[PDB]
Design a protein around this nucleic acid. Structure first.
Lengths: 80, 126, 186, 235, 49, 50, 88, 94
RNA sequence: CGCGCGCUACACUGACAGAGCCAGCGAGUACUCCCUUGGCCGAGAGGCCCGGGUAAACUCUGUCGUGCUGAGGAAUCCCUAGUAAGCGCAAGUCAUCAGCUUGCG
């Protein structure tokens, strides 16, 4: 009667750099919800961070979230 | 010497040359085969005359069709008219007149536009 | 004869192929989770219950089709198992989490019959295969009860069986007489 | 012709330019003494440079073929994922090009999308009417020849990949029926010694391959910036 | 002036006037080519002033 | 329900344009007056030509 | 530009002899007030239409707070009647 | 077969709408409308180029599914897309 | 300032990317949208070179999901079969018409 539900707590409102509200929609549409980001821009962001587009928002780990924050912070030190 | 029957099909501005020769059974339209030439929803209107007359009637003929002019629906109607008129004229010319009459009977019992193109004249209520 | 079997895992189901053993199409329309994705005996329509209480039934072709046919949002609390009836192609059963199993007809937008009697989570269910047992449902709850209901009398359990363990799984036999209730260590 | 004179003129012209920030193409204008007539000499070509003209970091080429686009898309999906599948964005046959792109807005969108263009020698003679005048006549973003020539009658694929590697960084060579022309050589943000090597080999190949009556018909080469003065190298 | 676009008969003429005001003063006028073709200024154009 | 307040102007009349920025309002009014005067001049010159 | 009531235009209507007690916007004003403060409106089970005798249908949604004062109400009604809609 | 795919060859027996649905046992419920619902005359797809509006009661002889398509193509944006209409009816019947 | 007539814009009838497949009328040694920064060859007038400002449609296949990214009142007018409506291409014909007109599919 013990099965690890270590992933089920993801329908919670995530926090990010400018908006403190970002639900579970998708990675690229969540980054579209982030203010100042376009859809192709978020696609470029996800492809740069090598996060799979199949994966949802809230299925991520903290280090992946943080490197997403760093690469939305600077778009030039990463190639573009 | 070789048996051949050429027939014409008409629509608004879609015309259809259909030349029928004794063959293995194939049917081509602009070279490409019949199951390929159409938008993917009018293929039943193409198969309507073959499906009425059965495949054994087309077992011996080989139909090559050219088409040009008009839009998609117009070309499809031109090809089905050319198919029906081709097989009826071939059966008129090279097999028995009774078989021709039975074929023309089944086709007219379905729809007359398979044989005689009825153009849309302008005659509104005068 | 077909080449489809479905695996639900998380907020998405993944319809697999049998011949190729490659995930043929991943369906991720869900809101929260996906608990049981079962395709019809026909082999064209997948049903799945979400964690938000809704159940979605949608057509799936041999390739990439995810066309939502119907949705139901009556449970308002997680739906853990839905199953089709093996005989009737348009009737399905659903054990929710709260206290209920219920029989749905696919065209309708309301449950055909409602069945209560359990006291905790109910989380396994099955139809009774066989010729004589046309309309008999069996469900195992977490209240250590396996109940079998007739679908002609919408009252209580026609038969009940009380174990001492949380009852996790149930299958009937194809013979129709005997049944396996998987509960705890035995 | 001397690289010392060429290097001092290029250094002084880089100084004149200086006195993101620059981003100006420096080129050289060839001037000859007689009119040019042969359409096979009017046929545009390319010159391989020892320092490639491109940056090659995010530039995305658009390739134009003639024989089946399905086969060429098969080749690009098969062969090379390191640089070639990173840089090839679209391959389009000439039939699909004339089909999907006759519109002003459509070809302007394509011009805005892609970064540089390659086409086959069997298609360049049809290209200028096919692509728009806004695509072709105005700016240097115009297709560069590749030799995709011996079911497509095509040279084998590894040689094709080598050809694309050369022709991405090559420089275009277009000729005018008149007695004047100009060929790009580099940018102002570069090093003038590399500029000197580039202009040296450009001069050599231009005179020995394209300009008919090789050095009898040759005349003045002026190194020039976009809007500044021109510095002389006679020939 | 100078012809700008030339259809079968009608032709647009560019470097002759500065404004639709001047043209609407000279509306209905008897223009003439060098070749000998007579013609008539008919109506001001709009988009190039 | 989250009620909302109807945005409307107090002294209403259809003949006056309503805009906050005096700059863009003045620019539009000047463009319209210029257009009307130009049309009047074109009509008067056309009648003179006839 | 102002609604036609019996508050100021009484002398004009009494002069021209047309039904001084029919030009009564205060009835519609107080009825809209009553129905927008009634608790079924807050529940959202309400939807209110106005048929003005020139024949004009006016859909009023529950989410609006009508101005309490008759003067603001009159200015609002005029702007609505001349621009076919009112934005929030 | 002359040139016919597998599904039409399978259902070569009689005439079925969209090559899947039968006409054989289609009961109508009202003796009033058994005259004016035309399902005696079969059809393959509803798109049939006919002059079914020359005089009265020729829509009483055009088939019923042709009427369904021709009434589906009724707004200011879908006035000519009869292929969209028959695609929609095929999807809805599936 | 007023009135109509056309034109444009206003989202499910969506966007993006691929694949496939259709017209008719049109041929006067004739047709070009600018204006300019520079430079070549030009005693002078110019010509060169480089920069700046055979359809629409439709069908099929996938990626994504309603998000100032809201189809028009009272009235009044018109319309009954290749009619309404949608769609583009061509031409510019001694009067009218480029802010458009007439053809044609």
């Amino acid at each position: 009667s013990l099965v690890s539900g270590e992933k089920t707590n993801f329908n919670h409102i995530l926090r990010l750099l400018n908006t403190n509200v970002d639900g579970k929609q998708k990675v690229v549409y969540a980054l579209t919800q982030i203010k100042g980001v376009g859809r192709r821009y978020s696609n470029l962001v996800c492809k740069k961070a090598d996060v799979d587009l199949k994966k949802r928002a809230g299925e991520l780990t903290s280090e992946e979230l943080e490197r997403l924050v760093t690469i939305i912070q600077n778009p030039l030190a990463y190639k573009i | 010497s070789v048996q051949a029957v050429q027939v014409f099909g008409k629509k608004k501005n879609a015309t259809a040359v259909a030349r029928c020769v004794q063959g293995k059974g194939l049917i081509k339209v602009n070279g490409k085969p019949l199951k390929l030439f159409a938008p993917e929803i009018l293929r039943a209107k193409l198969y309507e005359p073959i499906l009425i007359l059965g495949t054994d009637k087309f077992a011996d003929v080989d139909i090559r069709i050219r088409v040009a002019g008009g839009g998609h629906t117009s070309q499809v109607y031109a090809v089905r008219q050319a198919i029906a008129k081709s097989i009826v004229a071939y059966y008129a010319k090279y097999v028995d007149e009774h078989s021709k009459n039975l074929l023309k009977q089944e086709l007219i019992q379905f729809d007359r536009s398979l044989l005689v193109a009825d153009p849309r004249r302008c005659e509104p209520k005068k | 004869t077909n080449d489809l079997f479905a695996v639900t895992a998380g907020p998405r189901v993944e319809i697999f192929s049998i011949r190729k053993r490659e995930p043929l199409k991943t369906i991720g329309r869900f809101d929260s989770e996906a608990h049981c994705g079962e395709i019809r005996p026909d082999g064209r329509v997948l049903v799945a219950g979400e964690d938000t209480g809704r159940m979605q039934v949608f057509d799936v072709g041999q390739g990439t089709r995810a066309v939502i046919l119907k949705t139901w949002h009556i449970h308002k609390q997680p739906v853990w198992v839905t199953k089709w009836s093996p005989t009737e192609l348009t009737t399905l059963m659903s054990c929710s989490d709260d206290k209920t199993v219920r029989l749905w007809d696919l065209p309708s937008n309301d449950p055909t019959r409602l069945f209560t009697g359990h006291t905790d989570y109910v989380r396994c269910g099955a139809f009774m295969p066989g010729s004589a047992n046309s309309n008999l449902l069996v469900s195992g709850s977490y209240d250590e009860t396996v109940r079998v209901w007739d679908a002609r009398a919408p009252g209580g359990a026609v038969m009940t069986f009380k174990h001492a363990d949380p009852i996790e799984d149930v299958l009937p036999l194809p013979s129709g007489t005997t049944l396996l209730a998987a509960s705890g260590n035995a | 012709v001397d690289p010392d004179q060429t290097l001092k003129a290029c250094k002084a012209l880089l100084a004149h330019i200086k006195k993101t920030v620059a981003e100006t193409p420096i080129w050289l204008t060839l001037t000859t003494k007689k009119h040019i007539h042969d359409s096979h000499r009017l046929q545009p070509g390319k010159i391989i440079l020892p320092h490639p003209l491109n940056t090659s970091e995010e530039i995305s080429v658009c390739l134009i073929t003639a024989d089946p686009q399905r086969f060429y898309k098969n080749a690009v999906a098969d062969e090379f994922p390191e640089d070639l599948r990173a840089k090839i964005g679209r391959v389009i046959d000439i039939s699909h090009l004339k089909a999907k792109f006759k519109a002003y807005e459509a070809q302007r969108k394509l011009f805005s999308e892609h970064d540089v263009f390659l086409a086959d020698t069997r298609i360049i003679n049809r290209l200028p009417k096919a692509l728009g005048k806004t695509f072709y006549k105005t700016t240097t973003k115009r297709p560069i020849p590749v030799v995709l020539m011996a079911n497509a009658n095509a040279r084998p694929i590894p040689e094709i990949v080598a050809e694309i590697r050369k022709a991405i960084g090559a420089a275009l060579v277009h000729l005018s029926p008149s007695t004047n022309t100009a060929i790009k050589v580099g940018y102002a943000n570069w090093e003038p010694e590399k500029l000197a090597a580039n202009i040296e080999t450009v001069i050599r190949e231009l005179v020995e391959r394209f300009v008919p009556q090789k050095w009898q018909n040759v005349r003045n080469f002026y190194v020039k910036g976009p809007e500044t003065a021109a510095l002389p190298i006679y020939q | 002036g100078t012809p700008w676009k030339i259809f079968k008969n009608t032709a647009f003429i560019k470097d002759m006037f500065n404004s639709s005001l001047e043209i609407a003063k000279f509306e209905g006028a008897a223009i003439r080519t060098v070749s000998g073709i007579r013609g008539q200024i008919k109506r001001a154009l709009s988009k190039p002033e | 329900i989250k009620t909302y307040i109807p945005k409307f102007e107090d002294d209403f009349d259809p003949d006056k344009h309503y805009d906050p920025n005096r700059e863009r309002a003045e620019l539009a009014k000047l463009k319209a007056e210029h257009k009307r005067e130009r049309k009047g001049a074109l009509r008067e010159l056309r009648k003179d030509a006839q | 530009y102002t609604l036609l009531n019996s508050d100021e235009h009484i002398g004009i209507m009494r002069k021209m002899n047309r039904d001084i007690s029919d030009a009564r916007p205060d009835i519609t004003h107080q009825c809209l007030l009553t129905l927008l403060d009634s608790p079924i409106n807050k529940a959202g089970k309400l939807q209110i239409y106005i048929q003005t005798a020139k024949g004009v249908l006016i859909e009023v949604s529950p989410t609006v707070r009508i101005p309490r004062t008759f003067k603001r109400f009159a200015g609002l009604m005029v702007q609505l009647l001349h621009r076919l809609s009112i934005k929030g | 077969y002359d040139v016919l795919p597998k599904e039409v060859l399978a259902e070569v027996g009689s005439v079925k709408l969209f090559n899947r649905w039968s006409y054989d046992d289609i009961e109508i419920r009202d003796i009033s409308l058994t005259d004016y619902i035309q399902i005696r005359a079969p059809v393959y797809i509803p798109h049939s180029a006919g002059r079914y509006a020359v005089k009265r009661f020729r829509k009483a002889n055009c088939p019923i599914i042709e009427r369904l398509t021709n009434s589906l193509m009724m707004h200011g944006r879908n006035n000519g897309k009869k292929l969209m209409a028959v695609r929609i009816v095929a999807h809805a019947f599936e």
